[PDB]
Design a protein that fits this description.
Belongs to the TOPBP1 family. This protein is an alpha/beta fold and 220 residues long. The chain folds into two domains: 1-123, Rossmann fold (3-Layer(aba) Sandwich); 124-220, Rossmann fold (3-Layer(aba) Sandwich). It contains nine helices and eight strands. Helix 2 (51-58) packs parallel to helix 5 (100-120) and helix 2 packs parallel to helix 6 (140-152). The chain is elongated and about 60 Å long. The protein starts with a strand and ends in a 9-residue tail after the last helix.
């Protein structure tokens, strides 16, 4: 049990003060902007749909309201996290006015934290994409970001998209070359990239039929 924080959407003075506090209590703060899988807790000023937030959800981190740290300060130790989760009733029944997007991001973070924890309590490693073996066929501009998000949820991303890799893959995601029909014939889930984020965000998992790539539909 570890206390490794990253901070998001807070101002510099808040970050300085919170870093000081976290360190005094025996925690660590990872200062780099990019999501770091070694963190355990992220304190978020206001939930935004971005790579860092999505990766935190894929990894099942505590995604916390800053009132968590104020409670730690008072207590003089790291307190129980559940009542400070952005998606907890304790926060959401008090911030009844936040917009629908932030509510959605909050709930998704709490839901995956709980689900991943429940699975980890049963010896399943990693996060939302645990056991996925993924072939990625996307635009060079989007490639690194998709890889990082998948890896943050515990997916292995395979090198390239050659036919021999189909026998190793569970999933193939493509931007709307690569032989999709053959991958589908070899029972790979051949899906639009929107599936990845929708798997993280949706209360009930996206259904493969709706995300299936055109050449793979008959193989469902």
């Amino acid at each position: 049990k570890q206390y490794i924080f990253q901070l998001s959407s807070l101002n510099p003075q808040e970050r300085i003060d919170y870093c000081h506090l976290i360190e005094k209590l025996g925690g660590l703060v990872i200062e780099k902007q990019c999501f770091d899988p070694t963190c355990t807790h992220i304190v978020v000023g206001h939930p935004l749909r971005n790579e860092k937030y999505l990766a935190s959800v894929a990894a099942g981190k505590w995604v916390l309201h800053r009132s968590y740290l104020e409670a730690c300060r008072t207590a003089g130790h790291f307190v129980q996290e559940e009542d400070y989760e952005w998606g907890s009733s304790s926060i959401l029944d008090v911030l009844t006015g936040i917009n629908v997007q932030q509510r959605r991001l909050a709930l998704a973070a709490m839901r995956w934290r709980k689900k991943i924890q429940q699975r980890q309590e049963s010896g399943i490693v990693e996060g939302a994409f645990s056991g996925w073996k993924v072939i990625l066929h996307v635009d060079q501009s989007r490639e690194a970001g998709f890889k990082r998000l998948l890896q943050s949820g515990g997916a292995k991303v395979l090198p390239g998209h050659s036919v021999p890799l189909f026998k190793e893959a569970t999933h193939l995601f493509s931007d709307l070359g690569v032989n999709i029909a053959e991958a589908a014939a070899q029972n790979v889930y051949c899906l639009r990239t929107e599936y990845i984020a929708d798997y993280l965000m949706q209360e009930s998992p996206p259904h493969v039929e709706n995300y299936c790539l055109p050449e793979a539909i008959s193989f469902i």
